[PDB]
Design a protein around this nucleic acid. Sequence first.
DNA 1: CATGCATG
DNA 2: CATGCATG
Lengths: 259, 257
Amino acid sequence: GSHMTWLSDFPQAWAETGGMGLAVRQAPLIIPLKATSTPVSIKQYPMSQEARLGIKPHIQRLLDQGILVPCQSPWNTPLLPVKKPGTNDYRPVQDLREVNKRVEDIHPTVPNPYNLLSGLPPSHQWYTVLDLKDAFFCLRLHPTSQPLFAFEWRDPEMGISGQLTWTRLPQGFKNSPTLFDEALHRDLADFRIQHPDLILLQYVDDLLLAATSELDCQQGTRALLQTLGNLGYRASAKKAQICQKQVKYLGYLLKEGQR
Amino acid sequence: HMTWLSDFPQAWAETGGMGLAVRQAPLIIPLKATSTPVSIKQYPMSQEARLGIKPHIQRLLDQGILVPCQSPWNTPLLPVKKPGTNDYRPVQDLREVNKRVEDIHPTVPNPYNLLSGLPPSHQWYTVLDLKDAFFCLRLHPTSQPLFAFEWRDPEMGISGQLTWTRLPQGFKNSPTLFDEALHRDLADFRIQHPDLILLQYVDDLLLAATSELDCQQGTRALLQTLGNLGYRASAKKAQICQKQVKYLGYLLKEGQR
DNA sequence: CATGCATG
DNA sequence: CATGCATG
């Protein structure tokens, strides 16, 4: 149709119009520690006022959304101000290595990008590719697990005088990809059943919907967006590839052939 | 009916846990322009009272509804009672805090004027009350300092104060902020169900339908919507699809009492 | 920045 | 054994 019509018919489905997501059907996650792990408090590396100002907006947006909350924890990991090469564009990166080492690994069951796409039958050649924005943040952390990802932050304006931590699955945590992948799979099982004429590929927060015609792809995408929104997820409108015979997915490019 | 608790896990507190209004962003509480922090010292309480209350504080702590803090503000924590031998419940005297917070217009219905506008045509009702309603709304970090109170406890690792991360009890504007929050959230539901009459008084709801079937279809949709929005109803108190129910202290069968 | 590992 | 760099 247009892209704008897609934005208009599904405001709750896109991160750009429906605010940040939160998976309503997902119970708070408990992060099991290794049998012998004990809290570790890695001190915050000194940070220049310039770098701090540079990442302040990132922290603020999260605080305003309740994604970051104040806490007092025996755990602590460094907050790193990563500045884009040749610019004054900063972004925060939390070094969670010491926490990851004390958390038990979860054998990732995420499918191989290649096989996933290699299964698509030649009968379904119309595609819609979406990627959920701030995916991990849509999954809540049980309060007993929140203390694990604490970091230092100071700002009188926000009434923060010590530490903050995440209420959602953090970026940088080793099991986030698989935990999210499994969550979205559970949440989309119903959709798959309601649409036997459609193929749905999903790799963590990346989705590819395949149909036999532009019409079926159109109607399937409407259903998918409505389902994702109701479920509490948010797709990136700016990056979406709706109803095309040629799309980019998981690094792979599929036109009527592959990459 | 046992299908209600099995079919709608997210809508009931028992199966869905502490709620959290997903459409409602953490709340900022505006202080009056003249206001200044108030520090009221904690009145010492019997070691027997600090026991019957200890569990509450602990439970909130563990759910993250309470958090340690250092704040310029401080209000009393009162050891209330009950007929029982050891039934002490927390009561925070937020009066000095309320006097310093900017007032907001009362938008809550008048109790009775709510039922007065109830068509005789709708005689099938469902009464639901939301559990821990105010707690579904979060407090922005910037406004959390306002509600702090003293609890030095070695056992849990508290060196001084604790404060709320959710809309607290005793805060003058809690009833109004929740009522307005729930009203906005259930608006789409009202529009999509014109043949249904929905009354809302803070955390007390009453759904009215023309027939038993309509009530059941309506109730299923309401619970589904509440769950998705993050609210939680008390399945234990719920009166589902029946012509005689009690709502807002009003007994209403086929003739209001 | 800190640094874990595949890599020669 | 030494080290480039992807990733926290």
